[PDB]
Write a protein that holds these residues in place. Sequence first.
Motif, PDB file in Angstrom:
ATOM      1  N   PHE A  18      50.012   3.427 -13.384  1.00 28.64           N
ATOM      2  CA  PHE A  18      50.613   4.188 -14.467  1.00 28.64           C
ATOM      3  C   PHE A  18      49.881   3.662 -15.654  1.00 28.64           C
ATOM      4  O   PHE A  18      50.478   3.270 -16.640  1.00 28.64           O
ATOM      5  CB  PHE A  18      52.108   3.917 -14.578  1.00 28.64           C
ATOM      6  N   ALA A  19      48.560   3.648 -15.513  1.00 26.83           N
ATOM      7  CA  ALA A  19      47.651   3.087 -16.518  1.00 26.83           C
ATOM      8  C   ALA A  19      47.823   3.529 -17.961  1.00 26.83           C
ATOM      9  O   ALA A  19      47.718   2.709 -18.890  1.00 26.83           O
ATOM     10  CB  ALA A  19      46.196   3.257 -16.069  1.00 26.83           C
ATOM     11  N   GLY A  20      48.058   4.826 -18.150  1.00 25.90           N
ATOM     12  CA  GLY A  20      48.248   5.368 -19.487  1.00 25.90           C
ATOM     13  C   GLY A  20      46.976   5.137 -20.262  1.00 25.90           C
ATOM     14  O   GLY A  20      45.909   5.542 -19.818  1.00 25.90           O
ATOM     15  N   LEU A  21      47.070   4.482 -21.405  1.00 26.38           N
ATOM     16  CA  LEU A  21      45.871   4.184 -22.175  1.00 26.38           C
ATOM     17  C   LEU A  21      45.119   2.978 -21.572  1.00 26.38           C
ATOM     18  O   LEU A  21      43.909   2.839 -21.757  1.00 26.38           O
ATOM     19  CB  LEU A  21      46.234   3.933 -23.642  1.00 26.38           C
ATOM     20  N   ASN A  39      45.270   3.801 -11.558  1.00 30.87           N
ATOM     21  CA  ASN A  39      45.942   5.057 -11.224  1.00 30.87           C
ATOM     22  C   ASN A  39      46.722   5.690 -12.389  1.00 30.87           C
ATOM     23  O   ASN A  39      47.562   5.027 -13.051  1.00 30.87           O
ATOM     24  CB  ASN A  39      46.856   4.850 -10.035  1.00 30.87           C
ATOM     25  N   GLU A  40      46.429   6.974 -12.632  1.00 25.17           N
ATOM     26  CA  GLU A  40      47.051   7.751 -13.721  1.00 25.17           C
ATOM     27  C   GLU A  40      46.732   9.230 -13.559  1.00 25.17           C
ATOM     28  O   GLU A  40      45.565   9.596 -13.608  1.00 25.17           O
ATOM     29  CB  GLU A  40      46.485   7.288 -15.058  1.00 25.17           C
ATOM     30  N   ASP A  60      47.292  11.673  -8.423  1.00 18.55           N
ATOM     31  CA  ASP A  60      48.698  11.526  -8.052  1.00 18.55           C
ATOM     32  C   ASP A  60      48.974  10.371  -7.097  1.00 18.55           C
ATOM     33  O   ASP A  60      48.518  10.364  -5.953  1.00 18.55           O
ATOM     34  CB  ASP A  60      49.225  12.853  -7.488  1.00 18.55           C
ATOM     35  N   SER A 305      52.907   3.905 -24.762  1.00 17.74           N
ATOM     36  CA  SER A 305      52.220   2.654 -24.412  1.00 17.74           C
ATOM     37  C   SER A 305      52.905   1.285 -24.545  1.00 17.74           C
ATOM     38  O   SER A 305      54.140   1.170 -24.569  1.00 17.74           O
ATOM     39  CB  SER A 305      50.872   2.618 -25.136  1.00 17.74           C
TER      40      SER A 305
END
Length: 327
Positions: A18-21, A39-40, A60, A305
Amino acid sequence: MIEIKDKQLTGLRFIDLFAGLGGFRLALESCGAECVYSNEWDKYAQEVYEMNFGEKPEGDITQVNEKTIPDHDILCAGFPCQAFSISGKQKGFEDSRGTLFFDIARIVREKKPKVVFMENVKNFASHDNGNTLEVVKNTMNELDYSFHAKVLNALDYGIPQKRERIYMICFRNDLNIQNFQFPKPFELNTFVKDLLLPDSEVEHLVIDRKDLVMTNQEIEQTTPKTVRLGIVGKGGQGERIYSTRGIAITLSAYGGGIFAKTGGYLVNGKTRKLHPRECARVMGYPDSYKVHPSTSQAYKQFGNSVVINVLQYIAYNIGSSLNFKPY
Ligand SMILES: C[S@@+](CC[C@H](N)C(=O)[O-])C[C@H]1O[C@@H](n2cnc3c(N)ncnc32)[C@H](O)[C@@H]1O
């Protein structure tokens, strides 16, 4: 982003979920750890990620087989909070299915990392009269892990912004780690007024209004609190004006109002919204980080974040406990 002296995690590997930025990535990479999986699924997020880091996070997660995830020592996950449909055998592993948390757990059960590092919003310890926490706790205990969690506020760690979140740190039971502790607070010395760009670059964020009301006098000295100077419209969410000599209010990913996701500030006689760069800074990020070209996505991404600084301090202490092993 505070820069670390003693690189405690050199040699230790990690995965970015759920890496996001990629906040966790910057935090552990500053302590010497190296990234082996990311993963994101958000298109707009994978784009700003490969912009800085060079790789496009994988798609996903619920479609990814756990036997294909690299050997790693630390697991990072700033996951989305969801209620559990648990009317089952007390609390535990099986009672996770249907949640995103389940994916973390199915990955722990097969790869056995030494540490599991997570974070979530401030009202997580109380969600559903206690049974959301309980489940994450009893699931970790079953997979053979210790469970430490505490709520920290970013104004206590060098970032000028009111923002409490919960950090959870778990150690496998066979490593016998019984000395770990959370970072100690320190006096604040940077305020909103210090993060602003020159007026020239933010003119297009000024918002004029005839229903603007000044309730308070403008502050003369800096304070470690949010100072409200006025109201616009009704005086609710997104319609409040804050001082540039106090701390910034909580950045949100989906808030409403006139001063949408950033709140509005009184800067040089006029009232404006923060720019994306002054947003990165209020979150701890460094100026070398290339921001997304669309101001809308950037406000979403930043409000979702992590405060870099706080993560760095805990990452250091993780390495500490792990590295202390006398005869
Ligand atoms: C609270 S945040 C990201 C926080 C991360 N610390 C960062 O600094 O941005 C949650 C992330 O979950 C990602 N996400 C949600 N469901 C997902 C799924 N099924 N597969 C992959 N990513 C997912 C969201 O897109 C968002 O990027």
